[PDB]
Write a protein that binds this ligand. Structure first.
Ligand SMILES: CSCC[C@H](/N=C/c1c(COP(=O)(O)O)cnc(C)c1O)C(=O)O
Length: 320
């Protein structure tokens, strides 16, 4: 046992816990890959560092000399934020003035030069500014979590293995929600390379199931269902696409807290419902599914996920 040179040696090597009370009635088992345990409690912590580490080894960027830029409103902002933090990188994350003031604090806290755009233009208003700021900045650098290959690479070298070596090769199916598609692909390719019978089940919002023939729509399952095929996503690897609604996802994310003591984000719930539904198909008795729980639930107190219990809060008045 030794001391890590810095916060970045702490990335990866996340734990595997079974689902007990929620998997009621399954003939199969479901192990949860807890990315919430990542240093900044998110799976993005892998692509954040990965993409930087990579552009570094390639010699395309150098601390303070280069100026990382990146369009995103989700966790990769944080995964990048703390990696740029320890490695001394000026960072600029573009996102509409819409995203909570908290997701703004967290990056500010990391010295992230967050730049807000028109909260009506959505992602385009962000990427515009993003791209803009790039063409504008001499030594600016666009990471592009959806295009960059370091993304699935990292998953091919760690998440992939971690899962394999975790289940000791007995893994029967890999369940993952598709955001940039990096995880499912990267880690996915590596398992298939260790066993072709391994099944990669893709998960996406029922309300925005594009890989199911459906049309992109808005949903609450924050973190996946980008409404399109990220270049890094290699759909051919997917053996099946399970769809889940923002509602099951939510509910499931809640049962997870009250029955497993796993406080997780709504994307994790969805990945879990998916995994349990599969575990219940008769023909899968005895099989092992590994579902990725992408984030911790504390970074969602200000979201649809907590509105319910949130009233139970402010409302309830003190007792004497
Ligand atoms: C729009 S999409 C988004 C993406 C990223 N993340 C990441 C994530 C995911 C995805 O994962 P992938 O591999 O598919 O990418 C999920 N969930 C969660 C919670 C998270 O954060 C960011 O944020 O940037």
């Amino acid at each position: 046992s030794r001391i890590a040179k810095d916060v970045t040696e702490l990335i990866g090597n996340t734990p595997l816990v079974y689902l007990n009370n929620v998997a009621e009635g399954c003939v199969g088992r479901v192990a949860a890959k807890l990315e919430m345990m990542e240093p900044c409690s998110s799976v993005a912590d892998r692509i954040g560092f990965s993409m930087i580490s990579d552009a570094e080894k390639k010699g395309l960027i150098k601390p303070g000399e280069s100026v990382l830029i990146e369009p995103t409103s989700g966790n990769t902002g944080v995964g990048l934020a703390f990696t740029a933090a320890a490695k001394g990188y000026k960072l600029i994350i573009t996102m509409p003035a819409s995203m909570s003031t908290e997701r703004r604090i967290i990056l500010l806290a990391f010295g992230v030069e967050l730049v807000l755009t028109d909260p009506a233009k959505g992602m385009k208003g962000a990427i515009a500014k993003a791209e803009e700021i790039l063409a504008k900045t001499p030594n600016g650098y666009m990471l592009q979590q959806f295009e960059n290959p370091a993304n699935p690479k990292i998953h091919y070298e760690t998440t992939g293995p971690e899962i394999w070596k975790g289940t000791g090769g007995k893994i029967d199916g890999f369940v993952s929600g598709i955001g940039t598609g990096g995880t499912i692909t990267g880690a996915g390719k590596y398992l298939k390379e260790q066993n072709a019978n391994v099944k990669l089940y893709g998960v996406e919002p029922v309300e925005s199931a594009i890989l199911s023939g459906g049309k992109p729509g808005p949903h609450k399952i924050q973190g996946i269902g980008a409404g399109f095929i990220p270049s890094v996503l290699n759909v051919d690897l997917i053996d099946e696409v399970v769809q889940v609604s923002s509602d099951e996802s939510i509910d499931m994310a809640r049962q997870l807290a009250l029955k497993e003591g796993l406080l997780v984000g709504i994307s994790s719930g969805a990945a879990a419902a998916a995994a349990i539904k599969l575990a219940q198909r008769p023909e899968n008795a005895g099989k092992l599914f590994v579902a990725i729980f992408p984030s911790f639930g504390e970074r969602y107190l200000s979201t649809v996920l907590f509105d319910a219990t949130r009233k139970e809060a402010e409302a309830m008045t003190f007792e004497a």
